[PDB]
Amino acid sequence: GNIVAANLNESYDINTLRSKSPMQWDNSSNAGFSEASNTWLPTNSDYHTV
Ligand SMILES: *[C@@H]1O[C@H](CO)[C@@H](O[C@@H]2O[C@H](CO)[C@@H](O)[C@H](O)[C@H]2NC(C)=O)[C@H](O)[C@H]1NC(C)=O
């Protein structure tokens, strides 16, 4: 699903940022997309079940 668009300090169209959320692999931190502390966009919060 879409995410609620946070503000980025890079120039992005926030009307379309909802569809560019990171891919949801296994239920780790950042849904297995990264092992960093924070990603460039927030992961959707339903990644434990989806
Ligand atoms: C743009 O990025 C963040 C917000 O997305 C700005 O704020 C910093 O965010 C980091 C992330 O944890 C904090 O640790 C800092 O305390 C924040 N404040 C700072 C660095 O003053 C960040 O400032 C912005 N960067 C720009 C405008 O270059």
Distance from the alpha carbon of residue 49 to the mean position of ligand 1, in angstroms = 31
SS3 of the chain: CCCCCCCCCCCCCCCCHHHCCCCCCCCCHHHHCCCCCCCCCCCCCCCCCC
Question: Structure solved using which method?
Answer: cryo-EM
Distance from the alpha carbon of residue 8 to the mean position of ligand 1, in angstroms = 10
Nearest to 39 by CA among 1, 8, 2: 8
End-to-end CA distance of the chain: 9
For this entry, resolution in Å reads 2.7
Distance from the alpha carbon of residue 42 to the mean position of ligand 1, in angstroms = 15
Cβ contact 9:1 at 8 Å: no
Nearest to 49 by CA among 33, 23, 30, 26: 26
Distance from the alpha carbon of residue 9 to the mean position of ligand 1, in angstroms = 8
Q: Which residues contact 49 (CB under 8 A, 6 or more apart)?
A: none
The dihedral sign for the CA sequence 17, 19, 22, 27: positive
